[PDB]
Swiss-Prot record:
Family annotation (SUPFAM superfamilies): Transcription factor IIA (TFIIA), alpha-helical domain, Transcription factor IIA (TFIIA), beta-barrel domain
Binding annotation for DNA: 176-177
Sites bearing N-acetylalanine, chain numbering: 103
Identification of the protein by name: Transcription initiation factor IIA subunit 1
Subunit description: TFIIA is a heterodimer of the large unprocessed subunit 1 and a small subunit gamma. It was originally believed to be a heterotrimer of an alpha (p35), a beta (p19) and a gamma subunit (p12). TFIIA forms a complex with TBP.
UniProt xrefs under Pfam families: TFIIA (PF03153)
Cell location: Nucleus
Source organism (scientific name): Homo sapiens
Post-translational modifications reported in the UniProt record: The alpha and beta subunits are postranslationally produced from the precursor form by TASP1. The cleavage promotes proteasomal degradation.
Function (record text): TFIIA is a component of the transcription machinery of RNA polymerase II and plays an important role in transcriptional activation. TFIIA in a complex with TBP mediates transcriptional activity.
Alphabetical list of CDD domains matching this protein: TFIIA_alpha_beta_like
InterPro entries, per the entry: TFIIA_asu/bsu, TFIIA_b-brl
Family stated for the protein in its record: Belongs to the TFIIA subunit 1 family.
Length: 209
């Protein structure tokens, strides 16, 4: 399970929650590390198995770079379409992990509240490492409540001092280029576009250098 969804509104509110409990001595930094690892699994599996929407996007390719099997792209003048909303953004950064070998598993039911299902899975799946480290249900519920509270705060109108960076964090099936014409097949994506979260199962894109 890839670590790159840790830098998302869901992944950050969890890291901040974990930081507060370390700081208050309620959990060890090493238990925190285990939780993030379980989070990686829940969000990878949740995107692969519960999310179905398609997205199409167009933009101009400004910057491109491949490193350790992760593409990073910057595009200007982007348009992202669904069935059938449209979002424009002057600038977007796409970070994509190699999803060739993943290919996750079976596809379960869609859910009304994807983040809500991920929080439940994680809390259920770290209950036992908590118990084993001497930490009881009340601390586990303190993690759940901090996580959920920080998640709400991300929606606050005056929650940021400045514009938020437009970023897609996802996987790729295939990236190609024929001359100046790039094509993107991306999957299992969380986008933060003008302050707001959007998810995707599959995203297909075009860009010109």
């Amino acid at each position: 399970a890839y670590q790159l969804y840790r830098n998302t509104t869901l992944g950050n509110s969890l890291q901040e929650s974990l930081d507060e409990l370390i700081q208050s001595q309620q959990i060890t930094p090493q238990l925190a590390l285990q939780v993030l690892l379980q989070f990686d699994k829940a969000i990878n599996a949740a995107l692969a198995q519960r999310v179905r929407n398609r997205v199409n996007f167009r933009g101009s390719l400004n910057t491109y770079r491949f490193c350790d099997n992760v593409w990073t792209f910057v595009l200007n003048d982007v348009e992202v379409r669904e069935v059938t909303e449209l979002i424009k953004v002057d600038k977007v950064k796409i970070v994509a992990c190699d999803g060739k070998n993943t290919a996750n598993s079976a596809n379960t039911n869609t859910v009304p509240k994807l983040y809500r299902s991920v929080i439940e899975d994680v809390i259920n799946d770290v209950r036992d490492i908590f118990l084993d480290d001497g930490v009881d249900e009340q601390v586990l519920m303190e993690l759940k409540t901090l996580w959920e509270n920080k998640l709400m705060q991300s929606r606050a109108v005056d929650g940021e001092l400045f514009d938020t960076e437009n970023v897609v964090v996802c996987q790729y099936d295939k990236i190609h280029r024929s001359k100046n014409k790039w094509k993107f097949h991306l999957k299992d994506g969380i986008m933060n576009l003008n302050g707001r979260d959007y998810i995707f199962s599959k995203a297909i894109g075009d860009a010109e250098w």
